[PDB]
Amino acid sequence: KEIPDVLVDPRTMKRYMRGRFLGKGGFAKCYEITDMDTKEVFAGKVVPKSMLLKPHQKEKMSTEIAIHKSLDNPHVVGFHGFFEDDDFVYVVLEICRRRSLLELHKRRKAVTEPEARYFMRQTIQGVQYLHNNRVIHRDLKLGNLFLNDDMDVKIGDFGLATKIHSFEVDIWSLGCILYTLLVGKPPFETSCLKETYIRIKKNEYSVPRHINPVASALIRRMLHADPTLRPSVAELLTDEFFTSGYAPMRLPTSCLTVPPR
Template sequence: MAPLDPGGFAKCYELLDSETNKNYAGKIVSKALLVKPHQKEKMSMEIAIHRTLHHKHIVGFHGFFEDDSNVYVLLELCRRRSLMELHKRRRQVTEAETRYFMQQIIVGVQYMHGKKVIHRDLKLGNLFIDDNMNIKIGDFGLATKEEYDGERKRTLCGTPNYIAPEVLTKEGHSFEVDSWSLGCIMYTLLVGRPPFETSSLKDTYQRIKRNQYHIPSKISPTARSLITRFLHKNPLERPDVMKLLEDDFFTTGHLPKELPVSCLTTAPQVSSQINRKPLTEVKGHRKDENTPPVSELARKPLHGRTPPVVEKKDLKDREDVNEDIDDINKSIGEQDALCHLPEMMKQLVKVLDSKPCEKNPKQFDEAEDPAAIPVLWVSKWVDYSDKYGLGYQLNDGSVGVLFNDSTRLLLHQNGENLEYIDREWNESYPMMSSYPESLKKKVTLLTYFRNYMTEHLLKTGATMTPRDSDALARLPFMNSWFRTRSAIVLHLSNGTMQ
């Protein structure tokens, strides 16, 4: 039994059925929290509603039971956690991803509304993600059912950043509160923060009541229009959920059929599909502005000498690559490591000094959650930075090289798609079957590195099974690295550090 989420009203664990060997998410509610009548009614309502819902975009309900201490609810296990964790890692997602997620959420909401169920707490944290990157709506703790046509509920409930104005004013609310929440979700995915968020609850509620929010100019007209319709102050003016997928936002833009798991940490490679153009060079694509540049320390070769400057005549000369490869064979494993022990010692001392007091309760950290392990990491590497650079293989089988001239070349696991990033961070996407003459030497070296690692190096970590959606994945590249006599430190562009 492994914890999934510290939770508030309940605690969630990953449970294993010893007879069937199936895994479930177990929601455990202490009966000490179910003393008052309205608390018991809330728990009963949640179970009564959720157990009647069976849909591909709703968390599966597998049963419940109780003992003297707790109520136990068995639910479908969503290993990729929720859109909240994705949001924390990515902040903003692309419009294509937003279309993908929103389409699935809307289909789930359409099903609920067809069953007369109002969720009333749609938010990123209640939108779970399964192994195939499909959305599953969960947590029906605040859900209710319409008992008769036109009924207006008056309970004050919801999450502050997503709560509709008619709920705050207690004018009576119905299905339209879910439409409002859809607008808040869409805005948060695209902009990176909820539309009415402030530093105080009072100010947030005031902004909601005044319908005061701002859509950045970078948001497309179709997305802007749909968000505005969702967040209309008058609930009767909000779009009909049953007709939402006919909106221009879904019919005119690229809607991926599936997304790669790498989307949890890195934007997918969808721009070429959106523009319906062949894979061509994408000018001006840069790393996130908050990502620090590669340090001078990381740029130094292991032996401490400055890499030779790449001159124009060197690029024009037709070097004998086979001879270079022979040199690699002779010298791999014979390089002296650059010693950074003083810097490492300082960091180790800080870590040891910061050891928490054993008396303090253990804090649940996402990094301790097995489901939150990096999607991609380096499983093999070969260091030839005294002449060319660092070659490495990711756990999905893709290969990359960070060259000494600060350019990067990556080969997808299919062995055909390449990604090249020049020193100005411009990206291009050639193919192994067709690439510019200027990349010939680098492609040859990458091929050699791949063959060498396949034949001579052991793989660390688990093996990933390729999925069709991985064709959309933008591979993380080597951001920076350095090495000491006893360790190598690798930092990928998706935030993974090894």
């Protein structure tokens, strides 16, 4: 079933123009949509109701919307109201025309330290806002770390977010990220899916010796087996890793493909 060329809602009664395709997450396609009156551009998640015929799955998305809606912070994807018609649910979000930190990783492999310092900081500051507002992400991956044309990291995809394992799962996800950024490969990545889940359980990872001691030190703590021995969000910013070495405040767009100078 076709997705309407113009999108409208009963509430605000604003007309959006479905523009360029941006991607597809699971059963949700996403288009760059544009306000026909204001010309302000937004990323519109379009989920077809044929996926939400079951009231079970229809709850999970109504929770994702519930939470994301309440949020307001320069490191979480902006929320600008959802709406539905007879066929599709439409979630209107902040536009990030530089894709996700995953794309950056895939293209760059191991980034330089300052870049990880910059990304982690900004990422963590988002993670704090969440934890401060009693929100857990539970599903933090480089794909959830979107980038705008200013190279600001903005957290998205709250499809497994929950309001109040607890907070320590997020500190785990950020460990993997800081690993992947600095090391260039995910710490528990393997082709076999069962193998990954075993590696995680038995806590099987080895940080290469090429990585900075102070970096690895923190990476060990963030991935530590005892969730209660993992650092807190507030304890991250203050860590030697962020304070010892050079930390840039802005990043060039060049970082998407090559290292900065």
